[PDB]
Design a protein around this ligand. Sequence first.
Ligand code: MG
Ligand code: MG
Ligand code: MG
Ligand code: MG
Ligand code: MG
Ligand code: MG
Ligand code: MG
Ligand code: MG
Ligand code: MG
Ligand code: MG
Ligand code: MG
Ligand code: MG
Ligand code: MG
Ligand code: MG
Ligand code: MG
Ligand code: MG
Ligand code: MG
Ligand code: MG
Ligand code: MG
Ligand code: MG
Ligand code: MG
Ligand code: MG
Ligand code: MG
Ligand code: MG
Ligand code: MG
Ligand code: MG
Ligand code: MG
Ligand code: MG
Ligand code: MG
Ligand code: MG
Ligand code: MG
Ligand code: MG
Ligand code: MG
Ligand code: MG
Ligand code: MG
Ligand code: MG
Ligand code: MG
Ligand code: MG
Ligand code: MG
Ligand code: MG
Ligand code: MG
Ligand code: MG
Ligand code: MG
Ligand code: MG
Ligand code: MG
Ligand code: MG
Ligand code: MG
Ligand code: MG
Ligand code: MG
Ligand code: MG
Ligand code: MG
Ligand code: MG
Ligand code: MG
Ligand code: MG
Ligand code: MG
Ligand code: MG
Ligand code: MG
Ligand code: MG
Ligand code: MG
Ligand code: MG
Ligand code: MG
Ligand code: MG
Ligand code: MG
Ligand code: MG
Ligand code: MG
Lengths: 80, 81, 122, 87
Amino acid sequence: RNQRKVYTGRVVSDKMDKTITVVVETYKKHGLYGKRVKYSKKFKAHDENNIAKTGDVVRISETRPLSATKHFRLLEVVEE
Amino acid sequence: PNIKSAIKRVKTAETRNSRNASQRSAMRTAIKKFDEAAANNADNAKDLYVEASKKLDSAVSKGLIHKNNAARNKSRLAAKL
Amino acid sequence: MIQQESRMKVADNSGAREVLTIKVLGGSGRKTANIGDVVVCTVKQATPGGVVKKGEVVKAVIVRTKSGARRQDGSYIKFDENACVIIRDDKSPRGTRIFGPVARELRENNFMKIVSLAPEVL
Amino acid sequence: VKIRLKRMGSKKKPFYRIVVADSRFPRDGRSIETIGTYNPLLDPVEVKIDEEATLKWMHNGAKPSDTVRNLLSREGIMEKFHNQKLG
RNA sequence: AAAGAGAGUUUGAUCCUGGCUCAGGACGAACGCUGGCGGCGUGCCUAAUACAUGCAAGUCGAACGAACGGAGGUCCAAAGUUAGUGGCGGACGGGUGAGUAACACGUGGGCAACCUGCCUGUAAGUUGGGGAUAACUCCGGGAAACCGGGGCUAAUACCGAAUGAUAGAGUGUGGCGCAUGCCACGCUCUUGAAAGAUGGUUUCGGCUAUCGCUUACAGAUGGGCCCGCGGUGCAUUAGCUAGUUGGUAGGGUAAUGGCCUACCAAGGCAACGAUGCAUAGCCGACCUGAGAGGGUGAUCGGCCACACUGGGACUGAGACACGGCCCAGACUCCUACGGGAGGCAGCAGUAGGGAAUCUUCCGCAAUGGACGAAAGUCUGACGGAGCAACGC
RNA sequence: CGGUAUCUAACCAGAAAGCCACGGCUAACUACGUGCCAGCAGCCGCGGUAAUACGUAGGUGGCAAGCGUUGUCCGGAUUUAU
RNA sequence: UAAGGAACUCGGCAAAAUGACCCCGUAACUUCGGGAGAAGGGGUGCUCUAUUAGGGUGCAAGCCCGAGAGAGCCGCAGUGA
Ligand SMILES: [Mg+2]
Ligand SMILES: [Mg+2]
Ligand SMILES: [Mg+2]
Ligand SMILES: [Mg+2]
Ligand SMILES: [Mg+2]
Ligand SMILES: [Mg+2]
Ligand SMILES: [Mg+2]
Ligand SMILES: [Mg+2]
Ligand SMILES: [Mg+2]
Ligand SMILES: [Mg+2]
Ligand SMILES: [Mg+2]
Ligand SMILES: [Mg+2]
Ligand SMILES: [Mg+2]
Ligand SMILES: [Mg+2]
Ligand SMILES: [Mg+2]
Ligand SMILES: [Mg+2]
Ligand SMILES: [Mg+2]
Ligand SMILES: [Mg+2]
Ligand SMILES: [Mg+2]
Ligand SMILES: [Mg+2]
Ligand SMILES: [Mg+2]
Ligand SMILES: [Mg+2]
Ligand SMILES: [Mg+2]
Ligand SMILES: [Mg+2]
Ligand SMILES: [Mg+2]
Ligand SMILES: [Mg+2]
Ligand SMILES: [Mg+2]
Ligand SMILES: [Mg+2]
Ligand SMILES: [Mg+2]
Ligand SMILES: [Mg+2]
Ligand SMILES: [Mg+2]
Ligand SMILES: [Mg+2]
Ligand SMILES: [Mg+2]
Ligand SMILES: [Mg+2]
Ligand SMILES: [Mg+2]
Ligand SMILES: [Mg+2]
Ligand SMILES: [Mg+2]
Ligand SMILES: [Mg+2]
Ligand SMILES: [Mg+2]
Ligand SMILES: [Mg+2]
Ligand SMILES: [Mg+2]
Ligand SMILES: [Mg+2]
Ligand SMILES: [Mg+2]
Ligand SMILES: [Mg+2]
Ligand SMILES: [Mg+2]
Ligand SMILES: [Mg+2]
Ligand SMILES: [Mg+2]
Ligand SMILES: [Mg+2]
Ligand SMILES: [Mg+2]
Ligand SMILES: [Mg+2]
Ligand SMILES: [Mg+2]
Ligand SMILES: [Mg+2]
Ligand SMILES: [Mg+2]
Ligand SMILES: [Mg+2]
Ligand SMILES: [Mg+2]
Ligand SMILES: [Mg+2]
Ligand SMILES: [Mg+2]
Ligand SMILES: [Mg+2]
Ligand SMILES: [Mg+2]
Ligand SMILES: [Mg+2]
Ligand SMILES: [Mg+2]
Ligand SMILES: [Mg+2]
Ligand SMILES: [Mg+2]
Ligand SMILES: [Mg+2]
Ligand SMILES: [Mg+2]
């Protein structure tokens, strides 16, 4: 078979129903100087029933579009 | 139009439009009768249901509906009873 | 029945869009004009970019009125508004096209160009 | 899907590529996978062809043209295709 | 292996800093003087301004309507090689760069959330009925685009039936995954198909060849949707949004999804620049540069958007469709005044704007397209010729 | 396309050269005319009676069926400097 | 009171026009309170869902208060004076 993209981030907002928001950070070279710069992007993940709490590192996986802007589901919670 | 083929195409367009509209109206009316029977009481309903599915299946053989459409409608209205 | 200080909209392609009546030509004490009568008038509202500008003194003819005319056969015609077409020194319009119905009486007043361009001559 | 002949080169000096492409695309436009060359100017025709991808495309339903059929016949692709169909 | 040139100018003379100017290369270039030829290329950059004239998409008699020789009766003549309904194609090919700051494009993936005529292969079948309709012919309205009524007839035109689902439900067994779920197989009931045409043989019945039609399964092809990252100016543009944000049910589509509906909660995005204004099709690439970078998107190839302006749907596998349809708007034209017809950002060509850009040409011979069993028809695609020192 | 490319023979120095520049930057000077006028010009700036800079003639330099001028971009510009 | 709509007049004097309740929306300027009921708009009747959803009252019996939605019905006109 094939594989889907997986992202490990930290829960920021869990006040929706059965879904949360997760920030994923990564570094990148600059266009002309080559310096590391933080780059944080927010995705929306789907949980089973409101398990994850704010400020808990979670791993989420790619899936089909579940809603208008919702394309990820919770894979697990690494820690708090 | 100013092409000899366009006039024939448009005439065939009205003919096919009338035919397809007639069959589509018949199929929608059959579905409406079935869902009216299924929503209120039981009565025949199921007895209607069969021919309703017929109105879909033959329609696929006519070419005015997709096969997936017929299967989806049949499954969705089969859940009422 | 149009006299001085009466407003009536313009029904052709020229820049004018509403007009106020200044004088009724025809006699010393004349005080009323009807279908087929020429009046002196000024432009009170004009569409932007038109040929005829606001505040201009122009002549014009009456094409339809709320109290129309009676024919010799004993029949009557009435419209729902008062309308107007701006004309030149002769009886030719200053616009390109006419809007709305037009009374037949203008055919009897030698306004042959306005009659031809009208969508309907009632 | 046809194994077609694409023309390039210069004025009065044509050179040809044996290429497979769809019949709805431009002659010199988009194509799938080129397989050979064909040079008409020389009196003995020089035609190079893969002879392996050609048979795969023929098996998969790629009907050639008249001159491409002639070239495949002379180079033996058509006869080998018939043998493969029999065997 | 690659690897970079400076000069003049502030002072009575200096040395620094600093700006200005010049020496080089390249144009879809323009203007001036001048002008012999050949090969290969390029030519509205401005008004996505308005368009005379001609040609650019038709084809199938193997499904149903010709002159001649000429059976027959010194006279007319039967059978034998040529309009339309129907099928396929018109969604390809060709042209513009207006709009668009966004999954439009480039790059890399996902679809256990999808479709696909023609093409190839395989497994089954092409068994029986009906009611019509053009064409044609009469009656009218007719200025003309053309409208109605009566009668008559074919089909691979249309509509039921016999039988056939890996289509819907109910179930079972086994093996499995990326949560939703996927795969192989089995059981009972309910639905869904067809068309024949050109020949051969045989007995003539049959049998059979080719092209055809219906259903299912794979391949190939072309599309659909989702996602990570990447490519502009302004903060003298700071808040924006309410089907918006999420959920529970439902409708709709080939498919997931507030795509749409009802209900429930008040969410969501933003100084990592939200929202707004301005400009702009994107890329492979082109010019320059020692290189890093800077400027541009001429020709050609790939993707996208548009077709006088705005909106909508039908037919179709595929369109919300340049040379198809309906409505409104501006313009051009005909009228018997009731009403009708049109869209060169297709190939040539005309007017206008410009400092500035070409023949109202030949041919399907080659390559490629559409139709057909084939000959064959069409192809301003394309193969060629003409003009301009515009470039090498 | 098309009697087209190409080839074969006879005649002919005859039917075929222009543009810009010359004080320095930058290659290349003499005379005449004019006299802060006519004018040239990218800059330094030349022209008021002995002008290698204005116009012409002779000469010379560069390029060549081309040569000059203008408009846009990059370089020189380390003049946004990783 | 037809048509016109300040042409009357020293002067729109007089008359005419707006007017209730609910909802949307609202400018310059500012002493930051205002301007503001700015301006400009939309809805009101009766019947059935329906002794409503829900409230006040009472031990219960019962009695009062009555918003949104749907379907409809009737006039030129529904704060019908
Ligand atoms: Mg997935
Ligand atoms: Mg049936
Ligand atoms: Mg389908
Ligand atoms: Mg061929
Ligand atoms: Mg200088
Ligand atoms: Mg020139
Ligand atoms: Mg000359
Ligand atoms: Mg030449
Ligand atoms: Mg253009
Ligand atoms: Mg025919
Ligand atoms: Mg195209
Ligand atoms: Mg472009
Ligand atoms: Mg029949
Ligand atoms: Mg019949
Ligand atoms: Mg019949
Ligand atoms: Mg069956
Ligand atoms: Mg079965
Ligand atoms: Mg999987
Ligand atoms: Mg079974
Ligand atoms: Mg059946
Ligand atoms: Mg055949
Ligand atoms: Mg056939
Ligand atoms: Mg780039
Ligand atoms: Mg760019
Ligand atoms: Mg749903
Ligand atoms: Mg633009
Ligand atoms: Mg180039
Ligand atoms: Mg440099
Ligand atoms: Mg370019
Ligand atoms: Mg162009
Ligand atoms: Mg391109
Ligand atoms: Mg167009
Ligand atoms: Mg146009
Ligand atoms: Mg359809
Ligand atoms: Mg078309
Ligand atoms: Mg056109
Ligand atoms: Mg053209
Ligand atoms: Mg011209
Ligand atoms: Mg051809
Ligand atoms: Mg061909
Ligand atoms: Mg033709
Ligand atoms: Mg061409
Ligand atoms: Mg050509
Ligand atoms: Mg030119
Ligand atoms: Mg040249
Ligand atoms: Mg000749
Ligand atoms: Mg020759
Ligand atoms: Mg001789
Ligand atoms: Mg001689
Ligand atoms: Mg000679
Ligand atoms: Mg000689
Ligand atoms: Mg000589
Ligand atoms: Mg010469
Ligand atoms: Mg001189
Ligand atoms: Mg000289
Ligand atoms: Mg010289
Ligand atoms: Mg620099
Ligand atoms: Mg009155
Ligand atoms: Mg009144
Ligand atoms: Mg007043
Ligand atoms: Mg007075
Ligand atoms: Mg007064
Ligand atoms: Mg008063
Ligand atoms: Mg006020
Ligand atoms: Mg009423």
